[PDB]
PDB file of C-alpha atoms and ligand atoms in Angstrom:
ATOM      1  CA  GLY A   1       0.017  23.597 -44.540  1.00  0.00           C
ATOM      2  CA  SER A   2      -0.918  19.940 -44.856  1.00  0.00           C
ATOM      3  CA  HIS A   3      -2.782  18.227 -47.673  1.00  0.00           C
ATOM      4  CA  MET A   4      -5.298  16.888 -45.143  1.00  0.00           C
ATOM      5  CA  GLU A   5      -6.230  20.363 -43.900  1.00  0.00           C
ATOM      6  CA  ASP A   6      -7.044  21.623 -47.398  1.00  0.00           C
ATOM      7  CA  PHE A   7      -9.058  18.475 -48.143  1.00  0.00           C
ATOM      8  CA  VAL A   8     -11.173  18.986 -45.013  1.00  0.00           C
ATOM      9  CA  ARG A   9     -12.073  22.570 -45.894  1.00  0.00           C
ATOM     10  CA  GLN A  10     -13.242  21.705 -49.423  1.00  0.00           C
ATOM     11  CA  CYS A  11     -14.987  18.449 -48.401  1.00  0.00           C
ATOM     12  CA  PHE A  12     -17.180  19.658 -45.515  1.00  0.00           C
ATOM     13  CA  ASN A  13     -19.430  22.699 -45.523  1.00  0.00           C
ATOM     14  CA  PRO A  14     -18.094  25.909 -43.920  1.00  0.00           C
ATOM     15  CA  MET A  15     -20.548  25.822 -41.001  1.00  0.00           C
ATOM     16  CA  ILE A  16     -19.230  22.414 -39.923  1.00  0.00           C
ATOM     17  CA  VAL A  17     -15.596  23.455 -40.426  1.00  0.00           C
ATOM     18  CA  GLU A  18     -16.275  26.540 -38.293  1.00  0.00           C
ATOM     19  CA  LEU A  19     -17.757  24.554 -35.405  1.00  0.00           C
ATOM     20  CA  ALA A  20     -14.948  21.989 -35.551  1.00  0.00           C
ATOM     21  CA  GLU A  21     -12.341  24.760 -35.392  1.00  0.00           C
ATOM     22  CA  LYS A  22     -14.129  26.376 -32.445  1.00  0.00           C
ATOM     23  CA  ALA A  23     -14.413  22.954 -30.805  1.00  0.00           C
ATOM     24  CA  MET A  24     -10.695  22.247 -31.264  1.00  0.00           C
ATOM     25  CA  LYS A  25      -9.576  25.588 -29.783  1.00  0.00           C
ATOM     26  CA  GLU A  26     -11.465  24.753 -26.669  1.00  0.00           C
ATOM     27  CA  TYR A  27      -9.523  21.820 -25.198  1.00  0.00           C
ATOM     28  CA  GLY A  28      -6.575  23.652 -26.811  1.00  0.00           C
ATOM     29  CA  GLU A  29      -5.788  21.929 -30.114  1.00  0.00           C
ATOM     30  CA  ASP A  30      -4.668  23.331 -33.460  1.00  0.00           C
ATOM     31  CA  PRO A  31      -6.546  22.298 -36.631  1.00  0.00           C
ATOM     32  CA  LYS A  32      -3.398  23.079 -38.643  1.00  0.00           C
ATOM     33  CA  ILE A  33      -1.234  20.545 -36.776  1.00  0.00           C
ATOM     34  CA  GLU A  34      -3.650  17.888 -35.478  1.00  0.00           C
ATOM     35  CA  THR A  35      -4.939  17.373 -39.001  1.00  0.00           C
ATOM     36  CA  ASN A  36      -6.423  13.903 -38.536  1.00  0.00           C
ATOM     37  CA  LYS A  37      -8.334  14.970 -35.426  1.00  0.00           C
ATOM     38  CA  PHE A  38      -9.566  17.944 -37.469  1.00  0.00           C
ATOM     39  CA  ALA A  39     -10.997  15.579 -40.087  1.00  0.00           C
ATOM     40  CA  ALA A  40     -12.428  13.286 -37.403  1.00  0.00           C
ATOM     41  CA  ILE A  41     -14.321  16.087 -35.647  1.00  0.00           C
ATOM     42  CA  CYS A  42     -15.824  17.407 -38.889  1.00  0.00           C
ATOM     43  CA  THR A  43     -16.928  13.862 -39.741  1.00  0.00           C
ATOM     44  CA  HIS A  44     -18.432  13.277 -36.291  1.00  0.00           C
ATOM     45  CA  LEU A  45     -20.203  16.641 -36.531  1.00  0.00           C
ATOM     46  CA  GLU A  46     -21.769  15.942 -39.930  1.00  0.00           C
ATOM     47  CA  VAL A  47     -22.931  12.514 -38.738  1.00  0.00           C
ATOM     48  CA  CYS A  48     -24.613  14.113 -35.716  1.00  0.00           C
ATOM     49  CA  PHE A  49     -26.344  16.641 -37.983  1.00  0.00           C
ATOM     50  CA  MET A  50     -27.466  13.945 -40.429  1.00  0.00           C
ATOM     51  CA  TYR A  51     -28.625  11.837 -37.471  1.00  0.00           C
ATOM     52  CA  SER A  52     -30.779  14.656 -36.083  1.00  0.00           C
ATOM     53  CA  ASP A  53     -32.339  15.163 -39.527  1.00  0.00           C
ATOM     54  CA  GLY A  54     -33.429  11.509 -39.608  1.00  0.00           C
ATOM     55  CA  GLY A  55     -36.314  11.824 -37.153  1.00  0.00           C
ATOM     56  CA  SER A  56     -39.477  13.881 -37.222  1.00  0.00           C
ATOM     57  CA  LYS A  57     -39.417  17.685 -37.260  1.00  0.00           C
ATOM     58  CA  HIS A  58     -38.242  18.361 -33.707  1.00  0.00           C
ATOM     59  CA  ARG A  59     -37.356  14.927 -32.335  1.00  0.00           C
ATOM     60  CA  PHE A  60     -33.691  15.563 -31.481  1.00  0.00           C
ATOM     61  CA  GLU A  61     -32.067  18.257 -29.371  1.00  0.00           C
ATOM     62  CA  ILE A  62     -28.529  18.835 -30.643  1.00  0.00           C
ATOM     63  CA  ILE A  63     -25.858  19.006 -27.938  1.00  0.00           C
ATOM     64  CA  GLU A  64     -22.732  18.519 -30.062  1.00  0.00           C
ATOM     65  CA  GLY A  65     -21.353  21.649 -31.703  1.00  0.00           C
ATOM     66  CA  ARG A  66     -22.298  23.950 -28.826  1.00  0.00           C
ATOM     67  CA  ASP A  67     -19.690  25.488 -26.568  1.00  0.00           C
ATOM     68  CA  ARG A  68     -19.148  23.578 -23.337  1.00  0.00           C
ATOM     69  CA  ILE A  69     -21.141  25.935 -21.105  1.00  0.00           C
ATOM     70  CA  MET A  70     -24.203  26.167 -23.350  1.00  0.00           C
ATOM     71  CA  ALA A  71     -24.203  22.428 -24.071  1.00  0.00           C
ATOM     72  CA  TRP A  72     -24.251  21.724 -20.332  1.00  0.00           C
ATOM     73  CA  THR A  73     -26.962  24.373 -19.920  1.00  0.00           C
ATOM     74  CA  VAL A  74     -29.240  22.508 -22.343  1.00  0.00           C
ATOM     75  CA  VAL A  75     -28.367  19.186 -20.695  1.00  0.00           C
ATOM     76  CA  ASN A  76     -29.451  20.662 -17.356  1.00  0.00           C
ATOM     77  CA  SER A  77     -32.720  21.926 -18.845  1.00  0.00           C
ATOM     78  CA  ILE A  78     -33.456  18.552 -20.453  1.00  0.00           C
ATOM     79  CA  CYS A  79     -32.759  16.736 -17.178  1.00  0.00           C
ATOM     80  CA  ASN A  80     -34.709  19.179 -14.996  1.00  0.00           C
ATOM     81  CA  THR A  81     -37.791  18.804 -17.221  1.00  0.00           C
ATOM     82  CA  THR A  82     -37.864  15.117 -18.257  1.00  0.00           C
ATOM     83  CA  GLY A  83     -36.428  13.653 -15.051  1.00  0.00           C
ATOM     84  CA  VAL A  84     -33.657  11.868 -16.956  1.00  0.00           C
ATOM     85  CA  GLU A  85     -30.392  11.316 -15.091  1.00  0.00           C
ATOM     86  CA  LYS A  86     -27.615  13.840 -15.656  1.00  0.00           C
ATOM     87  CA  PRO A  87     -24.726  12.272 -17.617  1.00  0.00           C
ATOM     88  CA  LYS A  88     -21.140  12.592 -16.452  1.00  0.00           C
ATOM     89  CA  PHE A  89     -19.957  13.447 -19.976  1.00  0.00           C
ATOM     90  CA  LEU A  90     -21.642  15.618 -22.586  1.00  0.00           C
ATOM     91  CA  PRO A  91     -23.732  13.560 -25.047  1.00  0.00           C
ATOM     92  CA  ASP A  92     -24.302  14.400 -28.704  1.00  0.00           C
ATOM     93  CA  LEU A  93     -28.109  14.458 -28.981  1.00  0.00           C
ATOM     94  CA  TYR A  94     -31.249  14.060 -26.914  1.00  0.00           C
ATOM     95  CA  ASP A  95     -34.104  11.911 -28.234  1.00  0.00           C
ATOM     96  CA  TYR A  96     -37.368  13.531 -27.152  1.00  0.00           C
ATOM     97  CA  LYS A  97     -39.226  10.474 -28.483  1.00  0.00           C
ATOM     98  CA  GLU A  98     -37.208   7.756 -26.723  1.00  0.00           C
ATOM     99  CA  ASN A  99     -36.312  10.123 -23.833  1.00  0.00           C
ATOM    100  CA  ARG A 100     -32.596   9.374 -23.712  1.00  0.00           C
ATOM    101  CA  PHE A 101     -29.300  11.059 -24.486  1.00  0.00           C
ATOM    102  CA  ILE A 102     -27.293   9.696 -27.419  1.00  0.00           C
ATOM    103  CA  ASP A 103     -23.528   9.664 -27.970  1.00  0.00           C
ATOM    104  CA  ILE A 104     -22.745   8.963 -31.621  1.00  0.00           C
ATOM    105  CA  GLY A 105     -19.456   7.229 -32.386  1.00  0.00           C
ATOM    106  CA  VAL A 106     -17.486   7.212 -35.636  1.00  0.00           C
ATOM    107  CA  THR A 107     -14.546   4.807 -35.728  1.00  0.00           C
ATOM    108  CA  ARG A 108     -11.991   3.432 -38.167  1.00  0.00           C
ATOM    109  CA  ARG A 109     -11.669   0.167 -36.195  1.00  0.00           C
ATOM    110  CA  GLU A 110     -14.052  -2.627 -35.197  1.00  0.00           C
ATOM    111  CA  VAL A 111     -17.404  -1.343 -33.929  1.00  0.00           C
ATOM    112  CA  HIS A 112     -17.138  -3.957 -31.174  1.00  0.00           C
ATOM    113  CA  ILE A 113     -13.949  -2.702 -29.516  1.00  0.00           C
ATOM    114  CA  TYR A 114     -14.858   0.966 -29.992  1.00  0.00           C
ATOM    115  CA  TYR A 115     -18.224   0.442 -28.285  1.00  0.00           C
ATOM    116  CA  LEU A 116     -16.664  -1.082 -25.163  1.00  0.00           C
ATOM    117  CA  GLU A 117     -14.203   1.796 -24.759  1.00  0.00           C
ATOM    118  CA  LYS A 118     -16.975   4.371 -25.223  1.00  0.00           C
ATOM    119  CA  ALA A 119     -19.241   2.887 -22.545  1.00  0.00           C
ATOM    120  CA  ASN A 120     -16.301   2.590 -20.139  1.00  0.00           C
ATOM    121  CA  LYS A 121     -15.215   6.199 -20.678  1.00  0.00           C
ATOM    122  CA  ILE A 122     -18.554   7.978 -20.288  1.00  0.00           C
ATOM    123  CA  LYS A 123     -19.610   5.847 -17.277  1.00  0.00           C
ATOM    124  CA  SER A 124     -23.242   6.747 -18.063  1.00  0.00           C
ATOM    125  CA  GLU A 125     -25.032   3.436 -18.692  1.00  0.00           C
ATOM    126  CA  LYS A 126     -28.212   5.425 -19.419  1.00  0.00           C
ATOM    127  CA  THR A 127     -26.732   7.380 -22.336  1.00  0.00           C
ATOM    128  CA  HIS A 128     -27.690   5.490 -25.483  1.00  0.00           C
ATOM    129  CA  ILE A 129     -24.666   4.691 -27.655  1.00  0.00           C
ATOM    130  CA  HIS A 130     -24.669   4.242 -31.437  1.00  0.00           C
ATOM    131  CA  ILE A 131     -21.441   3.585 -33.362  1.00  0.00           C
ATOM    132  CA  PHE A 132     -20.820   3.992 -37.086  1.00  0.00           C
ATOM    133  CA  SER A 133     -17.755   2.687 -38.905  1.00  0.00           C
ATOM    134  CA  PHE A 134     -16.255   3.920 -42.159  1.00  0.00           C
ATOM    135  CA  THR A 135     -16.769   0.432 -43.637  1.00  0.00           C
ATOM    136  CA  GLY A 136     -20.549   0.332 -43.095  1.00  0.00           C
ATOM    137  CA  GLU A 137     -21.155  -1.504 -39.802  1.00  0.00           C
ATOM    138  CA  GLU A 138     -23.043  -0.069 -36.848  1.00  0.00           C
ATOM    139  CA  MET A 139     -23.659  -1.008 -33.220  1.00  0.00           C
ATOM    140  CA  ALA A 140     -26.277   0.497 -30.915  1.00  0.00           C
ATOM    141  CA  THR A 141     -27.162  -0.027 -27.267  1.00  0.00           C
ATOM    142  CA  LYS A 142     -29.690  -2.855 -26.806  1.00  0.00           C
ATOM    143  CA  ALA A 143     -29.621  -3.265 -30.618  1.00  0.00           C
ATOM    144  CA  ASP A 144     -31.966  -0.242 -30.695  1.00  0.00           C
ATOM    145  CA  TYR A 145     -30.859   1.837 -33.683  1.00  0.00           C
ATOM    146  CA  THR A 146     -33.313   4.718 -33.055  1.00  0.00           C
ATOM    147  CA  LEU A 147     -33.783   5.689 -36.718  1.00  0.00           C
ATOM    148  CA  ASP A 148     -35.200   3.738 -39.631  1.00  0.00           C
ATOM    149  CA  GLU A 149     -32.887   1.899 -42.014  1.00  0.00           C
ATOM    150  CA  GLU A 150     -32.920   4.559 -44.743  1.00  0.00           C
ATOM    151  CA  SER A 151     -31.609   7.350 -42.503  1.00  0.00           C
ATOM    152  CA  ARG A 152     -28.752   5.178 -41.243  1.00  0.00           C
ATOM    153  CA  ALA A 153     -27.889   4.011 -44.771  1.00  0.00           C
ATOM    154  CA  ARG A 154     -27.421   7.638 -45.834  1.00  0.00           C
ATOM    155  CA  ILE A 155     -24.916   8.098 -43.008  1.00  0.00           C
ATOM    156  CA  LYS A 156     -22.982   4.960 -43.973  1.00  0.00           C
ATOM    157  CA  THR A 157     -22.876   6.029 -47.631  1.00  0.00           C
ATOM    158  CA  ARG A 158     -21.453   9.449 -46.754  1.00  0.00           C
ATOM    159  CA  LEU A 159     -18.903   7.820 -44.439  1.00  0.00           C
ATOM    160  CA  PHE A 160     -17.666   5.532 -47.216  1.00  0.00           C
ATOM    161  CA  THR A 161     -17.516   8.488 -49.613  1.00  0.00           C
ATOM    162  CA  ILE A 162     -15.257  10.383 -47.204  1.00  0.00           C
ATOM    163  CA  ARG A 163     -12.900   7.404 -46.964  1.00  0.00           C
ATOM    164  CA  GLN A 164     -12.807   7.084 -50.761  1.00  0.00           C
ATOM    165  CA  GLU A 165     -11.960  10.778 -51.161  1.00  0.00           C
ATOM    166  CA  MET A 166      -9.033  10.486 -48.753  1.00  0.00           C
ATOM    167  CA  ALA A 167      -7.813   7.206 -50.233  1.00  0.00           C
ATOM    168  CA  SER A 168      -7.728   8.778 -53.701  1.00  0.00           C
ATOM    169  CA  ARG A 169      -5.506  11.513 -52.212  1.00  0.00           C
ATOM    170  CA  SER A 170      -3.310   9.010 -50.298  1.00  0.00           C
ATOM    171  CA  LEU A 171      -4.451  10.346 -46.918  1.00  0.00           C
ATOM    172  CA  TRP A 172      -6.563   7.390 -45.745  1.00  0.00           C
ATOM    173  CA  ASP A 173      -3.604   5.347 -44.481  1.00  0.00           C
ATOM    174  CA  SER A 174      -2.388   8.135 -42.193  1.00  0.00           C
ATOM    175  CA  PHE A 175      -5.988   8.755 -41.098  1.00  0.00           C
ATOM    176  CA  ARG A 176      -6.798   5.132 -40.235  1.00  0.00           C
ATOM    177  CA  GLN A 177      -3.451   4.733 -38.451  1.00  0.00           C
ATOM    178  CA  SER A 178      -4.235   7.899 -36.443  1.00  0.00           C
ATOM    179  CA  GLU A 179      -6.983   6.252 -34.362  1.00  0.00           C
TER     180      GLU A 179
HETATM  181  O1  LIG B 201     -18.166  14.888 -27.666  1.00  0.00           O
HETATM  182  C1  LIG B 201     -16.999  14.499 -27.699  1.00  0.00           C
HETATM  183  N1  LIG B 201     -15.961  15.215 -27.270  1.00  0.00           N
HETATM  184  C2  LIG B 201     -16.054  16.630 -26.951  1.00  0.00           C
HETATM  185  C3  LIG B 201     -14.889  17.421 -27.508  1.00  0.00           C
HETATM  186  S1  LIG B 201     -14.955  17.750 -29.252  1.00  0.00           S
HETATM  187  O2  LIG B 201     -16.261  18.257 -29.562  1.00  0.00           O
HETATM  188  O3  LIG B 201     -13.816  18.551 -29.596  1.00  0.00           O
HETATM  189  C4  LIG B 201     -14.774  16.183 -30.043  1.00  0.00           C
HETATM  190  C5  LIG B 201     -15.876  15.568 -30.613  1.00  0.00           C
HETATM  191  C6  LIG B 201     -15.724  14.344 -31.241  1.00  0.00           C
HETATM  192  C7  LIG B 201     -14.488  13.747 -31.307  1.00  0.00           C
HETATM  193  C8  LIG B 201     -13.391  14.365 -30.748  1.00  0.00           C
HETATM  194  C9  LIG B 201     -13.526  15.590 -30.118  1.00  0.00           C
HETATM  195  C10 LIG B 201     -16.644  13.156 -28.274  1.00  0.00           C
HETATM  196  N2  LIG B 201     -15.350  12.806 -28.245  1.00  0.00           N
HETATM  197  C11 LIG B 201     -14.974  11.630 -28.750  1.00  0.00           C
HETATM  198  C12 LIG B 201     -13.499  11.292 -28.672  1.00  0.00           C
HETATM  199  C13 LIG B 201     -13.031  10.139 -29.575  1.00  0.00           C
HETATM  200  C14 LIG B 201     -13.400   8.915 -28.753  1.00  0.00           C
HETATM  201  C15 LIG B 201     -12.937   9.307 -27.367  1.00  0.00           C
HETATM  202  N3  LIG B 201     -13.142  10.763 -27.344  1.00  0.00           N
HETATM  203  C16 LIG B 201     -13.070  11.562 -26.269  1.00  0.00           C
HETATM  204  O4  LIG B 201     -12.667  12.716 -26.367  1.00  0.00           O
HETATM  205  C17 LIG B 201     -13.552  11.029 -24.933  1.00  0.00           C
HETATM  206  S2  LIG B 201     -14.236  12.331 -23.868  1.00  0.00           S
HETATM  207  C18 LIG B 201     -15.989  12.267 -24.084  1.00  0.00           C
HETATM  208  C19 LIG B 201     -16.613  11.047 -24.349  1.00  0.00           C
HETATM  209  C20 LIG B 201     -17.985  10.996 -24.513  1.00  0.00           C
HETATM  210  C21 LIG B 201     -18.743  12.142 -24.409  1.00  0.00           C
HETATM  211  C22 LIG B 201     -18.143  13.353 -24.144  1.00  0.00           C
HETATM  212  C23 LIG B 201     -16.772  13.412 -23.980  1.00  0.00           C
HETATM  213 CL1  LIG B 201     -16.044  14.946 -23.647  1.00  0.00          CL
HETATM  214  N4  LIG B 201     -15.905  10.782 -29.291  1.00  0.00           N
HETATM  215  C24 LIG B 201     -17.244  11.114 -29.342  1.00  0.00           C
HETATM  216  O5  LIG B 201     -18.056  10.322 -29.844  1.00  0.00           O
HETATM  217  C25 LIG B 201     -17.601  12.349 -28.811  1.00  0.00           C
HETATM  218  O6  LIG B 201     -18.903  12.666 -28.864  1.00  0.00           O
HETATM  219 MN1  LIG B 202     -19.845  14.637 -28.418  1.00  0.00          MN
HETATM  220 MN1  LIG B 203     -19.947  11.317 -30.080  1.00  0.00          MN
END
């Protein structure tokens, strides 16, 4: 029973905690032990949800948070109807306006180094990439940040609030050193 696990459950809403737990049990990981990964997945999930709320009513299809089979099912439907290439790795969203998959990144390090590793790993040069850092920087493919400035600023504010809440509980150091 770690301090980090209790902080996560009272900091993020229960629907996000539920999906993160279900996500971690696929791939076979324990939220009670891998506490920093538990906090990272909840954070990445909330950012994806906030991101999808930034566009118009039904601009974004949400891929993250679904079980692996259903997420791939929607990816197949999106590809077999828009003609967009099928990614090798599951993205996070699909932009019906810009007609591209998006993988959102949340990092505790430099947005520069994290971007390079993300593009190398997915090996899908057509999946748009957008990174957020806990300090307030962001990096997007082709410098195309998809959303307007106000939607991204809300995400950066929430990210800095999360880091403050862990720092005030002396859990930020172990979190930052966990990536
Ligand atoms: O979707 C992700 N992983 C699915 C499992 S998860 O939902 O439990 C989870 C969701 C989010 C985070 C962890 C775990 C996902 N992973 C990652 C993590 C951290 C960076 C490397 N990295 C991987 O694991 C590489 S693999 C991968 C890479 C791109 C797309 C899809 C995959 Cl699979 N960073 C992300 O930005 C991210 O979107
Ligand atoms: Mn993802
Ligand atoms: Mn992602």
